[PDB]
Structures are given as C-alpha cells and as structure tokens.
Amino acid sequence: LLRAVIMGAPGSGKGTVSSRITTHFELKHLSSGDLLRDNMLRGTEIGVLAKAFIDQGKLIPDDVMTRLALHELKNLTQYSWLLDGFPRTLPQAEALDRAYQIDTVINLNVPFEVIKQRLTARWIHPASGRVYNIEFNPPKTVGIDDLTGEPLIQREDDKPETVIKRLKAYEDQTKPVLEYYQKKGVLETFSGTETNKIWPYVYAFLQTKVPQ
C-alpha cells in the first residue's frame, strides 16, 4: 500500500494534481485543510480550536495537528494514502516518521515568480462583482471595468504584499521538510511552470507505485 505525501506552495497546482491523482489511482486523499474544516463544520472541540488559530492567521500547533492527523491515519491503514498538507513543518515530518514508513514524497517545484504572478492576478469591479484575471481575462483597458470604465480593485488576499508574506512563511516552514525528505532519499521533484506540463510526469511516476 502506498504511503505518499504531496507538497507544494499555494498556487503551485497541488489541489489540481492531488485531485487528478485521486481520480486515477486507488488511494485515499487525506487533506489536512479538509480534515480541519470538517471538524470545524461538525463543531468538534478540535474544530473550535482550529477556528481559533485559523481566524487569527496562525498555524495549528505542531502537537495538536500531529495528534489529529495520526488519529485519522490509525483507522485508514488498510488503504493507500496521499497525504496533502501534512506534514507542514519539520516537527510534523519527524513525528510522522516515528509512526509510519513514508515511501514517496512528491514536491511540485514551480518558480516563485510564477506562483506570485498567479496569486496576484485577480482584480474586481466592486459594484458588479465582475472578476478580471490579468493572465486569463484582462480588462480591455488596464485597471478599469469593461462596462462602466470604473476602477478595479484588488482584494487584500490577492495583493502582492500579502502574497509575498504568505509565500515566505510557506518557504520558511517547508524548506527544512524538503531537506529532511531529500536526505532520506524519498523526495521526487517535478519542476514546471504550468500544471498541465507537470501532471503527465506525476501520472507516469505513480504508474509503478499504486494501482490504477
């Protein structure tokens, strides 16, 4: 049975790649964010704790997150796994190593400038809610709405300052995790600037590793 982790920065295409892996291979997709959000929805104590941290822009503490992830995994050992979002930090990776033999770690290596561009592409016309993406459907005139000529704005989560801070936090957290897995010889890296250029190689890689 496959014991796999997938890693990638926000905007790297991890959601898409993970969804495609789950569609094509006989395994369970175990997303930490989905596990947290399901607990939040069900109003469990770990859910209320999760919200308390998430709402303040904080990571779930390592000890709490690891206890929750391992508890989920305990009752999933009959299946192949793709862990997605855990481990997020070196202490989480080390704790996971003490619990299960992890055979494969996939990292999506998309250049910083490409991810930053993807994450800052969205502009909105506030009154109508019309969305423009300067990569995919830019406005006919820079900075203004096609129908009104009124200015476009960027939501706080899409501004370059916010995005740069998010990416730097991600890099600080995961650089040590990637080093850990690389030293262990289980890190497989897929580099590219478009998800559809990367996906075929991930798909081919997994052929010998887990049933279709």
Side-chain angles (χ1 to χ4, degrees), residues 44-197:
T44 64
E45 280 291 315
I46 297 304
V48 182
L49 178 150
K51 187 186 194 294
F53 283 93
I54 287 169
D55 286 1
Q56 300 298 322
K58 300 292 172 51
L59 293 190
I60 313 297
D62 288 335
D63 68 326
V64 175
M65 184 76 100
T66 299
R67 281 194 301 266
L68 181 71
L70 296 180
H71 197 278
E72 183 183 42
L73 294 172
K74 267 173 170 193
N75 297 113
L76 299 164
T77 61
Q78 71 269 48
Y79 302 110
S80 286
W81 303 337
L82 179 73
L83 299 173
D84 176 0
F86 181 93
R88 185 174 181 112
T89 66
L90 182 54
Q92 291 175 20
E94 296 167 337
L96 177 60
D97 181 79
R98 289 189 294 269
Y100 299 96
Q101 191 60 48
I102 299 306
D103 289 321
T104 299
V105 181
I106 290 159
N107 184 47
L108 311 176
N109 177 44
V110 179
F112 170 84
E113 290 294 340
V114 173
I115 299 167
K116 180 186 171 286
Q117 197 160 314
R118 290 184 187 162
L119 292 171
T120 59
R122 184 178 188 95
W123 290 77
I124 310 299
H125 171 65
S128 66
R130 279 184 282 278
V131 170
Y132 298 85
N133 181 298
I134 63 108
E135 311 184 306
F136 299 110
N137 67 318
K140 296 283 177 61
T141 304
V142 174
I144 67 178
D145 178 62
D146 288 357
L147 196 53
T148 60
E150 290 177 353
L152 304 181
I153 65 100
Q154 194 145 239
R155 74 184 180 207
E156 283 295 315
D157 288 330
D158 299 327
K159 288 175 176 190
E161 47 259 61
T162 308
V163 166
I164 290 164
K165 190 183 190 163
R166 183 180 185 196
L167 293 178
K168 283 183 189 335
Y170 175 88
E171 185 183 67
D172 290 345
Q173 289 153 19
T174 62
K175 167 185 191 74
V177 177
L178 295 170
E179 189 278 340
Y180 177 83
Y181 285 131
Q182 189 146 68
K183 183 175 178 170
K184 284 173 141 26
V186 300
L187 188 65
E188 184 77 15
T189 298
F190 299 87
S191 299
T193 60
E194 303 164 43
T195 302
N196 292 347
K197 293 201 292 184

Side-chain angles (χ1 to χ4, degrees), residues 2-41:
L2 183 67
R3 299 275 174 269
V5 175
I6 187 166
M7 295 179 76
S12 66
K14 183 166 71 193
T16 295
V17 171
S18 290
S19 175
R20 294 179 185 173
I21 290 167
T22 304
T23 294
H24 294 290
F25 296 99
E26 188 67 30
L27 58 74
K28 296 284 176 167
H29 180 202
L30 306 175
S31 160
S32 57
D34 289 347
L35 176 62
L36 293 163
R37 283 180 300 264
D38 183 58
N39 273 268
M40 285 178 267
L41 179 60

